[PDB]
């Protein structure tokens, strides 16, 4: 209840924080039709931890935890396995909005991992 | 559940009480049957007499190609419906296929034109040849043995066929994502007729790398010469487990890339260039990766090249694309997205086009991706072409090939080609810098004798006379 | 406290703070510079830019042959001093060798001749010459690397003289046992023209198989193709050390024979046979150790044969025979008589004729030692010819190698020649079953457009337009 | 009333205002127009702009032959019609004569080796090919003039398809026999295409030698090569009526014979000489006219000829035979039935077989007669070959003739076939003697400069400073 | 007062009691001894048997090119002092000449290449080859004749070889002005070896067309080939005395021209264009009459062909220039003069040099004269280049001969040079469009049997068995 309210909440605003200080991401948003207002969490673009080695990049109820299908990469429900985005809030150095190597399913909110991509 | 049999003298061995092993191919189980010691004992007493000459090996070649060009033929209806289910293939691809094995089996003057272009003459393989001071004859090494890599079947046919041009016996070692083509080529040859020397030189079975190495070992010593096709381990097993005296045709791993000069036609140029990204889901080392465009309008031709990659959508779509495959390919258009490269892409990820800038980062799945890069001079390209990894230099306007095949050539081409010709390994040429039954051949010399002089002495060759009378710098030319 | 040198680029190095080796050749010490990682960095960095053409390279051999060819020139009486004292040659022996290079170095229509019998044409590699269907160019691999064996010097100059045909640069690794025929070669070379790409490919050293691997696999590294020629443990030190990606040439050890059908000159057939007993001290691959005679006197070409055997003893004499040389020839002429082997031998333990029976036991020592057998038929031969280890099979009337050649052939012959040719590797043929600049070439393939239909079809290669209309079987031929 | 047209450029000319003349060929009468000024003035200025490669010209005879192969082609329809109308063939061989210029039409390899084997290579016609210190180019002579015989339509088809592989315009005068091969293989190239360049290189007309000389003589002075076909007077006007600095390919009046060595397998050697003895009624060139058997069955090939000859009686019937060719017939059997010569005929005086003595008299009509001699050796058939007079020298035992060619080509054979063969003038052989379109090609020679030397001198050629110097014999190998 | 000999089978004839005719050649009387009927049976009935092989002929021929090399050779030095009094050559060219024979003797490369070049193969005359579904042979025709021309005795000289190496035997019949050539090649082969089969095959003899027909035409009618050289009227009489069946290789007279695209090193250019004007007196048909300057320095080009022309005046001198010649000389210089066509001459009338526009009014006599002409364009020269007259079109920087060759074969080039080279026939090229051994030999063709498919069909030849069941069209491809 309140917690997704909780999580909601801050993860919009560090949306918002990322959005406008960091060119990279805005460019990357604006890359996927992404504005300045958006309502819902899964509205927001995620890019791969793989960039973290080619791009030096920088500006749990606060973790969303999301399994996202291959093709769409828009999240399934819970129970299937998917790609792995975190979305972390505590950050102010980097943009957290990654989507990992992993596969895993997510229980209603405990996060399993099955095994890496390759 | 489906069973794979294996072929050792012209026909299927009795696989009953052999023990089987599981592969799972494409999410579908099939049990190949172990090797044991009897088998390894029927391949080494395998000595079949091959009297042939090259017309009949060639019209045999060509009557099992007129078998697999009729569409009711039960094998060939059956290699598709296995392509499609444990391959992956779409129907049209491994119909494709299937239409090339009868094209590359049908073509009588290609295969004489190979053995004339590789040995000098169609004729050398059953006479002897007056070359030069000599008379010369192709004879068979015997008992050649094939490591096959398993994206393209149709490399697997060419190397056996090769084989067979040359009058070798075959033992074919089918890859452990392939083990189909080269038993219904051998059952093929079966079918067409079971008492010829072709169909009995065909040995197809299959081991692995994780098994004991006893009998693999065994059917290795029984060579003579080997033809490796794997990636680099592939090539490494062959090469620590083949006698040291024995040759290895080495097929290694590939990137080829593409060339597009400055086309003022430009959709003859998409399709090419399309045909070449597309073709065997860019698995072969002849399918294009990285393309250089020269000129001024990159984007009209990305918008053209976008265009045929949506008609190949349709006419020769994708494989099956396993969940890993999809996840890659998703997250390398992320990555893409993330350094502004211009990303294309069609639907249900059919394929991928990255504008990129020359030498950037990009990760490279060879599912339908390609990197496009604007060069303005062939002298940038010719730093991203090495020396036995580029294979294929496609070419687009075949014309501007003409000036830049030398400096190519110095780099390590190995190929150019016209963009909708990667696939097809053109007569008279060359696979890898090397032309393969050069080397599936034995060349035997009779040398004549010493009256008949050399071009340069015009002495008759007494050696034994003029040690005697100290006579030798005279005749020094 | 002789010292070799060391060539890397054109020129020998500055070895004076190098580590030294010697090496005791004939009781004589020589001191070999070790190589360091200054001399790899050397050699890795070498690239010389080689536009000659066939004809320039061909007359830069030419020039360097008459160089040789004046017995004046001081390389070449040092070289002919040094077979004497380090490789206990004779003074005959080692102007024969000298001689020999003279002659294969000045011998222009058999440079040319050897490349067009192996690669088509003399100007495959300098133009792209329509084949078939495609343009071929025979590019160089480059940094040929060339591990020597030790008892023919012609083996490694002739395998220098290939690579240099083909535009190949040279990194040569001299044998234990012949360290200076490849220095000389290339110091020739110097001499002639510093400045010349053929004299800046050359890259003489030396390393043994018993010290520290670094440097070797190092240059190893740099390979591109490698060409071994020693025994057994040599080539398998080749094949453990070389890129797998890397093509090796393998030159192994053989065992040559010589059949005598029915001579009525028997005098010549004795002349031809003891001189391929005789050359090179028996020593080569293609020298005669045993003999097969057919017909119905076997003790009047005994005779004969004796007789051309001291001839020889004259006109050619032996090396310098360490002791344990010495004992095995004295108790291997003791197993021999101990079994009424009729045997004969020359003074000084010059030479040494056993007329065993067929298959008996025999020991064999190369010292010039030949086992004469009555056969009364081909078919008795064949069974004592295998595949890779029997070379050649000299026949001495040499219109009987017409009924022969086949057989021996199948059997694994490589080379049928007169009985006083099994020195001369005539032009035309091969070597090993193999043309060996086959193998120290890059085909390279300039396909030519879809618009050039092939001989079979009559139809523009149009993939695209096809798979779209789903027309493929009504082209196959 | 049929009237013939008259081809020029490309397309039939309006031979409304011209004149016109009666042939009787068959005892049917046919229209000819006569060639006026105008046609000649529009022959000399013919010039078709042929910029075609030797694939494409492969190609368009290939489409050509496909439309031949068609039954209910008109043209092919019409062409059968007036064979047997006007050259009195009979429908079975009417027919085959369609369908052997179908197969000849539509055979590429063919095409191509006829190419590669008498000119070296199919792209000397097309680029400059570096034989040997020059680069060669193929090129037409141009207007090429083809006078026919009229025994054999597949003479004058191959005559014209040779013309057009060379790139040569070619104007055809047809015989006073056969006015419609020529005719219909031209209309056949316009239906196929008629803006092709090979289409608008075909003249074919007719002119008698009775008539007047000044346009026939125009036409001849425009010809740069003729191809004359006829017997001995024809021959003779075509030299006596070229301009002499024009070659003259000479196809003569041959007679061609059969050896029988021994056959085991009589029926195979009787059915091979039938078909020679019937096939084109015996009026080919090849045609055996005298059989030459050794062995001691001559009565048991007789007899099994004889059965062969009445098969060919029905499966390939003869011509209308004019009552002096009847009588002819009968009374040649008359005069060998008073000579005891063995003489068997067929109903409706279909062949005749004579069983003369070696050297007798026996008069030859070429209706289907044949003389068989008994020689018992090959030494006494040899002076019976004559030196451009025996053509094909027809053994039956196949291998026999491995030992009989070198004598049949020192006494003048020209060729030596397998006796089911003599009709088919095998890919890779000669006409007469002679690799025709070798002389149908101009040879155009681009020899390279002096810095390129030679293979015996090794020395720039450098003419001016050596006559300066005063040095030439220095260089004289 | 000075006797020629005759030679007919090896050795002179006793022509002691024939009749002699005086010749005035250079104003010098020279007895020939005229052809009586018992010479003409003497001709008839030479049948030199020839068994050699080509390496045989090319070591004779290499044998007396040695014994030419020598200056001491009495023959030799004979012949020079011949050229220099009958021929009235300066003592230079006449040594010049003499080398020549020498050096084309010697090279025996340049032989063995020729037979290769112009048959496909050097063994193609000794051995059967499998070209391509037959064996060939090349045979002699025997018996060939020759009529030389008179101003270049190396022609005669390369006729009589050419004939050689295809084991032809050779009647030459000597040119009215050069009686001494053959007479002195022939009679070295007999100084050589007297029993050789080439020695045995030379017929040296000479008649007039002024005198009796009979004598010649016998000899004319046992010719199997003929090979005529002279002009007009020489070629015309050889067509019209010849037998209608039998074969003419016609060398008539040319104009060769040069072309001088734009030379930054004009020395060299130079150089080679005084070297075509006055090798043998400009009397060749390769001798460079026209010289067509493209650039935009023509009379530094001609100051310095002015100052090459010099050089030659020296170190090659003229002739002797008979009263008429020299009246020629000053009037042609007056008519040029008479133009402003801006002439230059050498001391003694030795060169002309006339810079006419292009197009223009200009008598050329063929002393040493050249015309220069400015044409801004080669599209301005290919209407000055006729079909069977232009022989040479020598083009100065041979780089620029890539850009031409295309268009001046397209409008009868027939060759392009150096122009230090237009003497020199480089091997593996053509002469007049022709490869002329080719013409010398008959090709003998066996064909292989019905077993052996095409290349197209794949079906066994039964045409019996087809003809029975009406099967053709269904194997037609």
Redesign the interface.
Known sequence: DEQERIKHKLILESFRYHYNNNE?YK??CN??GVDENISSLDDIP???T??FK??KICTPPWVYARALD??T?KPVEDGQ?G?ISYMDASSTSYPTFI?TDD?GIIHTTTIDIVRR?? | IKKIPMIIGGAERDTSEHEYRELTLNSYKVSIPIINQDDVEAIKSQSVENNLNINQIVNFLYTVGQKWKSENYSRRLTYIRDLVRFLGYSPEMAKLEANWISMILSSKSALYDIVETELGSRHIVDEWLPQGDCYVKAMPKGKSVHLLAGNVPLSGVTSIIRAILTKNECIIKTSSADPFTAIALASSFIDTDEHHPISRSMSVMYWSHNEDIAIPQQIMNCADVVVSWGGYDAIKWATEHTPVNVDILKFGPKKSIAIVDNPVDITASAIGVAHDICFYDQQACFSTQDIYYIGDNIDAFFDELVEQLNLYMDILPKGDQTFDEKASFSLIEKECQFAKYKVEKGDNQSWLLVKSPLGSFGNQPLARSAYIHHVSDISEITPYIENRITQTVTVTPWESSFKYRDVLASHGAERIVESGMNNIFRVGGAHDGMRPLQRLVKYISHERPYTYSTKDVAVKIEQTRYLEEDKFLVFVP
């Open positions: 990279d460019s990357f890359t996927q995620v890019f791969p793989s960039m080619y791009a291959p093709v990469l396995e790609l989507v596969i991509l390759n």
